[PDB]
Design a protein around this motif. Structure first.
Motif, PDB file in Angstrom:
ATOM      1  N   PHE A  90       0.477  10.000  -4.364  1.00 35.32           N
ATOM      2  CA  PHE A  90      -0.383  11.018  -3.770  1.00 35.32           C
ATOM      3  C   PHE A  90       0.371  11.916  -2.793  1.00 35.32           C
ATOM      4  CE2 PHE A  90      -4.451   8.363  -4.512  1.00 35.32           C
ATOM      5  CZ  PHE A  90      -4.577   8.924  -5.767  1.00 35.32           C
ATOM      6  N   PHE A  91       1.033  11.329  -1.793  1.00 28.34           N
ATOM      7  CA  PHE A  91       1.718  12.135  -0.791  1.00 28.34           C
ATOM      8  C   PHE A  91       3.105  12.581  -1.233  1.00 28.34           C
ATOM      9  CE2 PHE A  91       2.386   7.653   0.162  1.00 28.34           C
ATOM     10  CZ  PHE A  91       3.759   7.567   0.273  1.00 28.34           C
ATOM     11  N   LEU A  92       3.682  11.947  -2.252  1.00 28.44           N
ATOM     12  CA  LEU A  92       4.970  12.367  -2.793  1.00 28.44           C
ATOM     13  C   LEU A  92       4.848  13.525  -3.774  1.00 28.44           C
ATOM     14  CD1 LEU A  92       6.720   8.918  -3.487  1.00 28.44           C
ATOM     15  CD2 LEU A  92       7.036  10.428  -1.525  1.00 28.44           C
TER      16      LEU A  92
ATOM     17  N   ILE B 196       6.348  17.000  -1.784  1.00 28.36           N
ATOM     18  CA  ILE B 196       7.421  16.783  -0.816  1.00 28.36           C
ATOM     19  C   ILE B 196       8.696  17.494  -1.255  1.00 28.36           C
ATOM     20  CG2 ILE B 196       8.985  15.032   0.106  1.00 28.36           C
ATOM     21  CD1 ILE B 196       6.764  13.268   0.698  1.00 28.36           C
ATOM     22  N   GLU B 197       9.241  17.108  -2.402  1.00 28.14           N
ATOM     23  CA  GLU B 197      10.477  17.697  -2.906  1.00 28.14           C
ATOM     24  C   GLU B 197      10.371  17.811  -4.423  1.00 28.14           C
ATOM     25  OE1 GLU B 197      13.870  18.868  -1.469  1.00 28.14           O
ATOM     26  OE2 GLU B 197      12.044  19.544  -0.453  1.00 28.14           O
TER      27      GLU B 197
ATOM     28  N   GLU C  89      12.551   2.267  -1.310  1.00 24.63           N
ATOM     29  CA  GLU C  89      13.507   1.789  -0.317  1.00 24.63           C
ATOM     30  C   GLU C  89      12.854   1.634   1.051  1.00 24.63           C
ATOM     31  OE1 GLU C  89      16.351   4.872   1.315  1.00 24.63           O
ATOM     32  OE2 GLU C  89      17.793   3.271   0.893  1.00 24.63           O
ATOM     33  N   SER C  90      12.066   2.627   1.470  1.00 23.94           N
ATOM     34  CA  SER C  90      11.402   2.547   2.767  1.00 23.94           C
ATOM     35  C   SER C  90      10.331   1.464   2.785  1.00 23.94           C
ATOM     36  CB  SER C  90      10.794   3.901   3.132  1.00 23.94           C
ATOM     37  OG  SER C  90      10.120   3.841   4.378  1.00 23.94           O
ATOM     38  N   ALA C  91       9.647   1.247   1.659  1.00 19.99           N
ATOM     39  CA  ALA C  91       8.620   0.214   1.615  1.00 19.99           C
ATOM     40  C   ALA C  91       9.226  -1.182   1.630  1.00 19.99           C
ATOM     41  CB  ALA C  91       7.738   0.401   0.383  1.00 19.99           C
TER      42      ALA C  91
ATOM     43  N   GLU D 164      14.269  10.393  -7.318  1.00 22.60           N
ATOM     44  CA  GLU D 164      14.864  10.286  -5.990  1.00 22.60           C
ATOM     45  C   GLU D 164      13.801   9.997  -4.939  1.00 22.60           C
ATOM     46  OE1 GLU D 164      16.866  13.806  -4.739  1.00 22.60           O
ATOM     47  OE2 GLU D 164      17.510  12.965  -2.815  1.00 22.60           O
ATOM     48  N   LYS D 165      12.604  10.565  -5.106  1.00 21.70           N
ATOM     49  CA  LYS D 165      11.520  10.305  -4.166  1.00 21.70           C
ATOM     50  C   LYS D 165      10.914   8.922  -4.376  1.00 21.70           C
ATOM     51  CE  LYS D 165       9.206  13.962  -5.259  1.00 21.70           C
ATOM     52  NZ  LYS D 165       8.104  14.965  -5.283  1.00 21.70           N
TER      53      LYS D 165
ATOM     54  N   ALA E 194      13.388   6.497  -2.869  1.00 20.13           N
ATOM     55  CA  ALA E 194      13.332   6.566  -1.413  1.00 20.13           C
ATOM     56  C   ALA E 194      12.072   5.898  -0.876  1.00 20.13           C
ATOM     57  CB  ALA E 194      13.408   8.021  -0.952  1.00 20.13           C
ATOM     58  N   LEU E 195      10.935   6.108  -1.543  1.00 23.66           N
ATOM     59  CA  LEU E 195       9.699   5.461  -1.115  1.00 23.66           C
ATOM     60  C   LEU E 195       9.766   3.955  -1.335  1.00 23.66           C
ATOM     61  CD1 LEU E 195       6.526   4.507  -1.936  1.00 23.66           C
ATOM     62  CD2 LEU E 195       7.048   5.752   0.170  1.00 23.66           C
TER      63      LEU E 195
ATOM     64  N   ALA F 283       0.817  -1.208   0.000  1.00 28.02           N
ATOM     65  CA  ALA F 283       0.000   0.000   0.000  1.00 28.02           C
ATOM     66  C   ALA F 283       0.853   1.262   0.000  1.00 28.02           C
ATOM     67  CB  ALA F 283      -0.940  -0.002   1.203  1.00 28.02           C
ATOM     68  N   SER F 284       2.048   1.206   0.596  1.00 30.40           N
ATOM     69  CA  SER F 284       2.916   2.378   0.616  1.00 30.40           C
ATOM     70  C   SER F 284       3.356   2.760  -0.792  1.00 30.40           C
ATOM     71  CB  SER F 284       4.130   2.118   1.509  1.00 30.40           C
ATOM     72  OG  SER F 284       3.733   1.829   2.839  1.00 30.40           O
TER      73      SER F 284
ATOM     74  N   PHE G  84      -0.179   4.010  -2.904  1.00 31.94           N
ATOM     75  CA  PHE G  84      -0.571   5.391  -2.656  1.00 31.94           C
ATOM     76  C   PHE G  84       0.604   6.360  -2.701  1.00 31.94           C
ATOM     77  CE2 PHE G  84      -3.662   2.653  -0.602  1.00 31.94           C
ATOM     78  CZ  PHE G  84      -4.865   3.190  -1.011  1.00 31.94           C
TER      79      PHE G  84
END
Lengths: 184, 184
Positions: free
Chosen positions: A156-158, A161-162, A174-176, A167-168, A171-172, A149-150, A153
């Motif tokens: 939407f929230f990215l 951000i920057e 990588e975190s997921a 790169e985003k 990073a998303l 789900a990360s 979605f």
């Protein structure tokens, strides 16, 4: 090239997509779309009876790489490394649908028609089939759903951000992946 | 006393009950008027549409999140506070669970342009609190990842057969780990 063929159908989706991005989904009328092709509304209605039908057909085309991912994923040994590469390719498949998420954030009507749409809801359901762990308990099953789900979605929230999305997106992704590893 | 706010809250409480037992699409204005015991004239005096009731139900269930925003604006703006608002925002969305169940089960009959306006203003107010100025691109994405995991949690966890509270507990802990990942 026929006025009732497939090339004129794809041509309707292209100009309507441009009309949805520049002027907005709710502000684009069927008359403006017909004027873009230079044909009559009767010729437009033959392929698409409503404006929501055009938006769904656009999602069908930009979701190709997702359907290609499901084909390759169902031919894998169904390991935890398999689910990681599916999550990587799914983050890469959603690049083509970037203007679609942009429209959903602009128009709440485009958000409801596509989110409730059966075709787009079937894609993420097929991806979840490969992510599902048979013998996982409640804690482990929620974490593998959080990892999918990360990325789902993410567009939407990215948004604000920057600057650079790659790169985003990395990073998303990588975190997921770390949340996917949290399944243990 | 049929023109007062006590009856208005009675309309929302009765309509919310019927929306859970038999469904939003299977509930009409007549059944809500008969379920309360007043005439349809008295019903339409407070709400002139079935969706208009659901908008008031969304604002009523969005009480805790509004008070959470007010409390968090008076907090030292630290990572511990961000964990507190993230832990309390999960509790606030638990109360709005019947609303999310309606949005997920009801199809094109429900137009969410009304409740989506208030829903976007709540996540925007929460997002300004989780936002960090001197954060890198990696840490900014991980913060929004923790927020989006709890935000959309009532939607991507609906298919898991676990206990509703236990699923929220596991997701809140997974997002809290992702929130702590943005540190340093």
């Amino acid at each position: 090239p026929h006025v009732r063929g497939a090339n004129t159908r794809d041509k309707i989706q292209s100009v309507a997509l441009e009309l949805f991005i520049e002027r907005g989904y709710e502000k684009t009328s069927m008359r403006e779309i017909a004027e873009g092709l230079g044909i009559t509304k009767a010729a437009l209605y033959y392929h698409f009876k409503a404006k929501e039908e055009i938006l769904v057909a656009i999602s069908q085309g930009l979701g190709g790489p997702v359907d290609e991912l499901v084909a390759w994923a169902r031919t894998q040994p169904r390991t935890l490394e398999t689910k990681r590469e599916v999550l990587r390719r799914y983050s890469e498949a959603l690049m083509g649908a970037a203007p679609l998420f942009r429209i959903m954030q602009e128009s709440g009507a485009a958000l409801r028609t596509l989110g409730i749409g059966q075709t787009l809801n079937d894609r993420i359901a097929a991806i979840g089939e490969l992510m599902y762990q048979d013998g996982a308990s409640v804690r482990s099953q929620v974490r593998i759903s959080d990892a999918l789900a990360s990325v789902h979605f993410g567009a939407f929230f990215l948004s604000a951000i920057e600057g650079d999305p790659e790169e985003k997106r990395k990073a998303l992704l990588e975190s997921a992946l770390e949340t996917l590893d949290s399944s243990a």
